[PDB]
Design brief:
The structure is cut from a larger assembly and holds three copies of chain A, one copy of chain B, one copy of chain C and two copies of chain D.
Chain B lengths: L2 H7 L2 H4 L12 H15 L12 H8 L5 H10 L1 H7 L5 H13 L7 H4 L3 H16 L2 H6 L20 H9 L16 H5 L26 E7 L11 E7 L3 H10 L3 E7 L1
Antiparallel strand pairs in B: 1-2, 1-3
Helix pairs in contact in B: 3-5, 4-5, 5-9
Chain C lengths: L11 H4 L12 H15 L12 H9 L4 H10 L1 H8 L4 H13 L6 H14 L1 H9 L2 H6 L18 H10 L19 H6 L42 E7 L14 E6 L3 H10 L3 E7 L3
Antiparallel strand pairs in C: 1-2, 1-3
Chain D lengths: L3 H11 L6 H26 L1 H15 L15 H24 L3 H8 L2 H7 L4 H14 L4 H18 L1
Helix pairs in contact in D: 1-2, 2-4, 2-8, 3-4, 3-7, 4-5, 4-8, 7-8
The complex binds phycocyanobilin (CYC) (13 copies).
Chain lengths: 172, 266, 289, 162, 172, 162, 172
């Protein structure tokens, strides 16, 4: 897998070229955002159970067919699998945020997930809806102003939004 | 197919394709489009050089001297079609290319391989090619004025189900072509009247997690196995292995004498 | 097979335990049984807390995304396995544990130690685990869909030295491979280096002299070099391993474990003396003739 | 790719757990090192051609037989000299990659893995490349944290070759 | 394929729900952005031949192994096929820019392309390098301030760069 | 599916051509229509439940037999009424999708294709849905371009049904 | 696998018959050629490293795009994997020469190798070119008339050429 540094390194190595001044400057720029990125990872991790639980409750409240008997989230084993799945997605989204690259999320988590869900009859649209709930729950937690140094986190919020969209798009 | 299966199978463009019909009193750009569509589909989406174009045949199509079916026949009988699909190909690969280019489908039965093989042996390439274009299937699907298009992904009347699956063995994607000598992928499937799993578009990929190796790449090995160890429970087998254990899987498959039918990235 | 001594050893529960195979198109109990068997055998019967369970590997095995062999590989390469068996152990002990978990047998000779130690040092732990799992022995015994199990019974390419060393690595059913008397020490370093064997001492509840372990030095050798000459007239000589010697107390008793070569004619007296010294007989092996 | 961040995520993922304070401290150390690594990469990149030519000359000086003995593995002709300069440039460029990535991962992925098979098959002496790396160490002109991290990667390559 | 509107339409239909207020406002924002999107498509189209020819020249200068005898761009037929691949990739990038969605790239341009290149022996990394050259040239052409109403086209330039990068990653 | 942008691109691609001024004019027409289409979709979405309930009642009023004859295809019981309201909501939601997309493509892909043999197999009369669409036309309360486009979609559905 | 004797044994057993006098005489003729077969195997084995290294050098000289950055033989692990593949092909060709039968080469080396190279993106045609270089060097080495009892080795050389062609045809 790649992080934000090794992605540019791999592209440069494929070209057999040193990183240009602009690429090194961009990497320095993402180093300057590193504190904000660590804060984002920490805040989502510190609220992960609440994010998963509230998102799942909202998902079943707006889609009661998932929890009706015979529904895909009915029975404790399938409900546990669904909750675990939400937590797995959230965890790999945090991995992608930490690394600064979606390679871990795409390669280890998202690849083949749509096929698995199809093969199992897990409704990918409702999983995408659940990831969307985890989306704003986590974006509001990252953007919570209380008890943190003042500054603009719009870029890291956009990057986390992109990871969450990749996961929802992959499942749906 | 509908979108939800179409994106997974990578056949969205085929589904939304609209049949192209040369109507009477067609303009110059319409004849240009028909000629381009015929070159694209009959020659299997190759980059066609201007020196390989059938200038006289397309002139006859332009002056309404011949029909779309006649121009398709002229392209199919042309030395360009022979060069890139016949002279360097086995007969079974050649006739599946004919089925794809001329009827827009994969072969249904091994008897269809026995046909067009005996037909070649008796009447030559020209008779063998004319069998497809003069067939009832071509007439009912395309007639004299509709450019042939691929139909294997849609339910056809008088069709076997396997054709749909076998369709993914002859259509490898929108940005693909039948350019490279090659062996048919359907030889064993046709001979033994079987079906193979569709690994097209995003269907081939599988979950990795932490089980994939250092480079996070899984490989699917479809093999045919028998007892040479532990008990074999199926003749067909699928192995999902990381890249770092791929060589080891190949060698242990090799020393048991199992034949590898397919290896793909998953 | 092992029939009369199966219960005395820890072999009896594994005699009626059939290998756990994941059939094609398996059910969910089959998947859970494979997960349970892999945890019990690969992690050497350690209790697995819920927080240490590999949820993702279990999910993938359940889904069919990985095979039993792949799941075993993921468990053996996991941080849980390395915490339990790698980070606090001499690499020879790591090799012993690898052979016991992934192959269900003890190492046969020093060549295996050479191969695995070189491979760990040159390519890492993951490559070494791969060599255990991609081995011809693994393929013939377990293959792709069978959980590794203890190979107590004689097989085609066995050596009897492995049968003896199995009971140095396995110490009973209610034992956990990190809860054995020798703890983190390698059990086979001296044996593999010297190509020697130890008399088999069975597990605790079935064998009173279970706790016998030879010391670092000052151990009575296996065979009676010299014959019966130091014992006057004697018929046959026996090596007796004695554990839990305590009654006389220090300094009369220095080591609680003692091996003695005694003649047949003194065997009665030896047994009485052992009873007096409060000891337990671990094993008795012919030492002469 | 052995980098602090990728390995931190991989270790966390093997345990199937979220990133705790340990991984955050790994990221903080990576941030502390990254600017020096980037300036080291810039300094090596800007001086790369003179470093490669000087390193090649240093190797040719220490082992004159490489410039005067016929054979595919030597630099007695222009083709061998070009191959030698290309190899030293590979070494320097991948070292800059390591400085950017914050670990030996580029060296491991691109150069170190399999290099001894390369040198054995093509009869290339690793002592030549050790001398080239020593010239780069002695002539990169770096100071402080940048020098320490760059010398770590150059010494990593030297230790692999020896 | 999808445009910027039908993507969210298909997502909503899978969810069986109406487009929310936020989605409709986001689509309205995309519509207000539409004129600069049409300019970017027009500017790339009007300079397509120069983009393809200059990028090909740069690629063959940087990688002369392609054009030397025995190389994959040697002989007129192979060289012309390479030039057609470049033109085709640029055309599909314009399609993606025009529609506002990338599905036209996956459905058509990148659907089996890597398989095609592997089967023929076309070097995919070299194709990715050529695509990167076309990216830099096309982004320069789109960002040209002469002869156009001044304004911020950073979002559309980022989107076009994303289409180019996705095309490059399909073959790299 | 059928939208001005996707069809412009598909027509251009089938002809192997770049997008020319023709496709640009197509995009300009889409932009001119799109804001009105979006505000029509918003207005239909806000008043969606009232429109669906009123349409179902209008269908029941003009076809009273659907409310007291027993059978799977009728709405005499609660199950039939739920199915009927769900179907009318399907029609309204897909019409809003068409207004968003700028073409009948959502209607064709989701509802129109295959509607006739569904209506035939389950013995569902298309005149019921025609009356529902007529109520939606008469009660959506739209004006200008929003009304014109929405009514075009509604009577496209009506024409497909009749 | 099969060797030269077990091949005709398997064919005879599938027919329920003993070998005929002609089959036994053909096998006796194979026996009479056994010293030259052992000589050819020994000569290729004694020069295996030279054959692999010289063939690889010739291949990368004629196909420089394999070793330029981004090429499939670029980076030390891929160049070493390529040299290892050359060595494996040569070794299984020697096995086929030793057994007098191509079954070992087909069943243990060429089984799925084309699919493996396609899946990995390894250019099979370039592998075949390397195999052709190994062929030409090895056939020269087997025909070298210095320090060996003079004889006509054309039949064994043709057989070795057939094994090399089998390998090159399977990869290409
Ligand atoms: C980034 C892309 C650059 C940029 C663009 C930009 N364009 C406009 C405005 C308009 N552009 C057009 C386009 C066309 N008119 C035509 O007839 C044709 C051929 C069919 C085209 C392509 C139109 C209609 C307008 C509106 C009228 C006007 O000239 O203002 C803007 C202004 C904002 C807007 O959305 O209208 C912008 C920002 N501007 C830059 O600075 C970039 C280099
Ligand atoms: C074509 C292959 C070349 C060739 C071969 C050739 N060899 C012999 C004869 C022999 N060579 C051997 C070989 C070995 N003796 C050993 O102990 C070992 C090491 C294990 C080897 C490899 C033997 C035993 C013989 C027979 C006795 C002898 O020394 O002659 C012949 C002679 C014919 C025969 O089959 O006996 C030939 C023709 N000769 C050429 O000209 C080719 C270049
Ligand atoms: C929850 C929002 C939705 C839902 C979920 C659900 N998922 C499954 C089963 C599986 N989920 C996975 C996914 C993963 N496993 C991993 O290790 C990782 C990381 C690589 C992922 C993403 C897998 C593999 C399975 C199958 C194996 C298993 O059961 O664990 C189920 C159970 C399905 C069944 O019939 O057993 C469920 C219920 N279901 C919903 O309805 C929600 C919308
Ligand atoms: C209904 C009980 C279930 C269901 C069905 C469903 N099937 C398809 C698509 C196809 N069905 C076939 C099958 C055949 N075609 C034939 O000609 C024959 C006879 C020889 C058979 C058996 C094929 C080939 C297809 C694909 C091509 C085509 O659609 O024309 C679909 C559509 C899938 C899509 O995404 O479009 C559906 C919905 N689906 C369910 O959920 C039911 C359980
Ligand atoms: C140029 C940058 C590089 C290069 C290219 C090259 N490509 C081919 C052959 C083909 N290219 C395609 C691609 C497409 N066809 C389509 O219809 C689409 C649109 C969806 C795409 C993307 C295809 C299918 C082929 C197959 C053959 C054909 O003739 O169409 C070649 C020809 C190879 C040969 O002649 O054997 C070449 C040379 N080669 C380089 O070296 C550049 C790096
Ligand atoms: C040039 C000296 C004179 C001239 C020529 C002209 N011809 C056409 C059109 C056609 N010409 C043919 C003839 C053939 N096509 C063939 O393939 C062959 C061999 C079998 C022949 C003899 C045909 C069939 C056409 C019609 C199709 C086409 O237009 O290509 C035109 C064009 C007429 C039009 O576009 O309507 C022209 C201009 N015109 C002169 O003024 C010269 C005296
Ligand atoms: C509780 C009353 C007392 C106590 C217990 C305690 N036990 C252990 C560890 C283990 N217990 C067993 C026993 C079994 N495992 C089995 O499978 C079976 C049936 C066949 C039995 C009887 C084993 C093998 C272990 C070791 C495995 C492991 O994971 O520990 C511990 C843990 C010790 C430690 O973690 O260091 C404890 C605490 N402790 C008390 O204080 C109570 C008096
Ligand atoms: C070198 C200074 C001296 C020397 C060394 C020597 N050692 C061995 C053999 C072994 N060394 C070990 C060591 C370890 N095992 C581990 O687990 C750890 C790391 C965690 C260590 C350090 C082991 C287990 C062996 C046995 C396996 C093997 O042989 O490699 C030998 C070979 C002994 C033999 O006869 O085979 C040697 C030569 N010998 C000297 O003379 C030096 C003073
Ligand atoms: C027969 C002459 C006498 C006899 C034999 C007997 N042996 C066993 C059990 C085992 N025998 C072995 C021996 C070996 N295993 C090996 O791998 C090797 C070769 C490398 C040897 C020599 C072992 C280890 C066992 C136990 C494991 C197994 O049997 O698979 C038994 C069975 C005892 C029991 O069932 O408990 C018997 C009966 N018994 C006599 O009475 C004869 C004098
Ligand atoms: C005290 C910190 C812990 C403890 C001790 C304990 N020890 C014994 C018994 C014995 N200890 C020895 C000692 C030695 N043998 C040697 O040769 C050496 C070196 C010279 C030593 C230190 C021996 C031989 C015995 C057995 C005979 C004897 O008792 O003298 C006991 C008694 C055990 C019993 O039940 O018999 C105890 C209690 N126990 C604890 O709980 C402390 C942690
Ligand atoms: C320079 C210090 C000395 C020297 C160099 C020399 N090297 C070769 C050949 C090769 N060098 C490599 C090395 C690499 N390839 C890579 O991709 C990387 C990792 C990114 C490395 C380090 C390889 C693989 C080769 C062989 C294939 C190739 O030509 O690329 C040669 C030629 C050897 C031959 O037999 O052709 C030479 C001359 N020579 C000197 O005399 C210097 C002291
Ligand atoms: C309401 C106007 C009248 C009515 C309705 C009614 N409909 C059904 C059953 C079905 N309706 C559909 C329609 C759709 N499904 C879709 O996915 C879409 C496109 C997005 C549409 C338009 C279908 C397919 C069915 C059958 C399957 C199902 O039950 O969902 C029924 C029940 C018929 C039955 O036999 O179950 C009813 C009652 N009934 C009235 O009396 C109204 C006048
Ligand atoms: C060299 C002439 C060409 C080349 C080779 C190349 N191969 C690989 C990777 C693999 N090659 C194999 C093949 C085998 N492994 C075996 O054990 C055997 C016997 C059954 C064979 C034939 C396999 C399985 C692999 C992948 C796994 C592994 O490497 O162990 C590579 C590496 C590709 C990569 O790292 O992504 C390369 C470079 N490449 C060229 O460019 C030459 C034309």
């Amino acid at each position: 897998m790649f992080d934000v540094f090794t992605r540019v390194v791999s592209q440069a190595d494929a070209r057999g070229e040193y990183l240009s001044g602009s690429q090194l400057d961009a990497l320095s720029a993402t180093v300057a955002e590193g504190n904000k990125r660590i804060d984002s990872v920490n805040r989502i991790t510190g609220n992960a159970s609440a994010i998963v639980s509230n998102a799942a409750r909202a998902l079943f409240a707006e889609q009661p067919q998932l929890i009706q008997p015979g529904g895909n989230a009915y029975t404790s084993r399938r409900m546990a699998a669904c909750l675990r799945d939400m937590e797995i997605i959230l965890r790999y989204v945090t991995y992608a945020t930490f690394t600064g690259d979606a390679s871990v999320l795409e390669d280890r988590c998202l690849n083949g997930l749509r096929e698995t869900y199809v093969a199992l009859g897990v409704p990918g649209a409702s999983v995408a809806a659940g990831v969307q709930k985890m989306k704003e729950a986590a974006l509001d937690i990252v953007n919570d102003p209380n008890g943190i140094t003042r500054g603009d986190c719009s870029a890291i919020v956009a990057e986390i939004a992109g990871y969450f969209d990749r996961a929802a798009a992959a499942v749906a | 197919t509908s979108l939800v299966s179409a994106q997974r199978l990578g056949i969205v463009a085929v589904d939304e394709a609209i049949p192209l019909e040369l109507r009477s009193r067609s303009t110059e750009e319409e004849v240009d489009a028909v000629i381009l569509a015929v070159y694209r589909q009959v020659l299997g989406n190759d980059h066609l050089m201007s020196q390989e174009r059938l200038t006289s045949a397309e002139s006859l199509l332009r002056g309404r001297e011949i029909s779309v079916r006649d121009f398709v026949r002229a392209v199919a009988l042309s030395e360009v079609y022979r060069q890139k699909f016949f002279h360097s190909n086995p007969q079974n690969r050649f006739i599946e290319l004919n089925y794809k280019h001329l009827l827009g489908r994969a072969p249904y039965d091994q008897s269809e391989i026995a046909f067009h093989t005996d037909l070649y042996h008796q009447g030559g390439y020209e008779a063998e090619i004319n069998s497809y274009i003069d067939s009832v299937e071509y007439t009912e699907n395309f007639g004299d004025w509709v450019v042939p298009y691929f139909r294997g992904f849609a339910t056809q009347r008088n069709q076997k189900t396997v054709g749909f699956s076998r369709s993914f063995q002859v259509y490898r994607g929108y940005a693909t072509s039948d350019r490279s000598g090659s062996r048919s992928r359907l030889t064993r499937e046709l001979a033994r009247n079987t079906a193979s799993p569709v690994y097209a578009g995003s269907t081939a990929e599988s979950l990795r997690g932490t089980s994939a190796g250092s480079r996070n790449q899984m490989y699917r090995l479809q093999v045919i196995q028998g007892a040479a160890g532990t008990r074999v429970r199926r003749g067909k087998a699928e192995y999902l292995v990381s890249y770092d254990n791929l060589s080891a899987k190949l060698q242990q498959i090799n020393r048991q004498g199992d034949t590898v039918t397919m290896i793909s990235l998953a | 097979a092992i029939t009369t001594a199966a219960s005395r050893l820890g072999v009896a529960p594994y005699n009626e335990s059939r290998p756990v195979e994941l059939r094609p198109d398996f059910s969910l109990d089959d998947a859970k049984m494979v997960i349970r068997a892999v945890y019990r055998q690969v992690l050497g019967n350690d209790y697995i807390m819920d927080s240490e369970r590999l949820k993702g590997a279990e999910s993938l095995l359940t889904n069919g995304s990985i095979s039993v062999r792949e799941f075993v590989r993921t468990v053996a390469k996991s941080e849980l396995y390395k915490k339990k068996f790698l980070y606090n152990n001499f690499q020879t002990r790591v090799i012993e544990l690898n052979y016991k978990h992934l192959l269900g047998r003890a190492p046969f000779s020093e060549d295996e130690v050479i191969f695995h130690l070189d491979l760990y040092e040159n390519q890492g732990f993951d490559a070494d685990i791969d060599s255990y799992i991609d081995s011809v022995e693994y393929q013939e015994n377990f293959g792709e869909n069978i959980v590794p199990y203890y190979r107590f019974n004689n097989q085609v390419g066995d050596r009897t030295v492995g049968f003896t060393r199995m009971f140095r690595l396995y110490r009973g059913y209610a034992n956990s491979d990190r809860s054995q008397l020798e703890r983190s020490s390698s059990r086979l370093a001296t044996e593999l280096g010297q190509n020697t064997v130890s008399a088999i001492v069975g597990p605790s509840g079935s064998n009173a002299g279970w706790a016998y372990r030879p010391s670092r030095a000052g151990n009575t050798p296996a065979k009676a070099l010299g014959g019966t000459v130091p014992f006057g007239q004697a018929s046959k000589l026996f090596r007796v391993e004695i554990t839990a010697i305590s009654a006389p107390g220090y300094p009369k008793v220095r080591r609680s474990n003692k091996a003695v070569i005694v003649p047949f004619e003194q065997l009665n007296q030896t047994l009485q003396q052992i009873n007096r010294l409060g000891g337990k007989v671990a094993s008795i092996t012919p030492a002469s003739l | 790719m052995k980098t602090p961040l990728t390995e931190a995520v991989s270790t966390a993922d093997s345990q199937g757990r979220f990133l705790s304070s340990t991984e955050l401290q790994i990221a903080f150390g990576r941030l502390r090192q990254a600017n020096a690594g980037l300036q080291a990469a810039k300094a090596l990149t800007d001086n790369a051609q003179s470093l490669v030519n000087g390193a090649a000359q240093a190797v040719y000086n220490k082992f004159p037989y490489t410039t005067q003995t016929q054979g595919n593995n030597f630099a007695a002709d222009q083709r061998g000299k070009d191959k030698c300069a290309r190899d030293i440039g590979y070494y320097l460029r991948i070292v800059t990659y390591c400085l950017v990535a914050g670990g030996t991962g580029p060296l491991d992925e691109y150069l170190i893995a399999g290099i001894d098979e390369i040198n054995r098959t093509f009869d290339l002496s690793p002592s030549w490349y050790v001398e080239a790396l020593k010239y780069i160490k002695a002539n990169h002109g770096l100071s402080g944290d940048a020098r320490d991290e760059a010398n770590s990667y150059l010494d990593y390559a030297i230790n692999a070759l020896s």
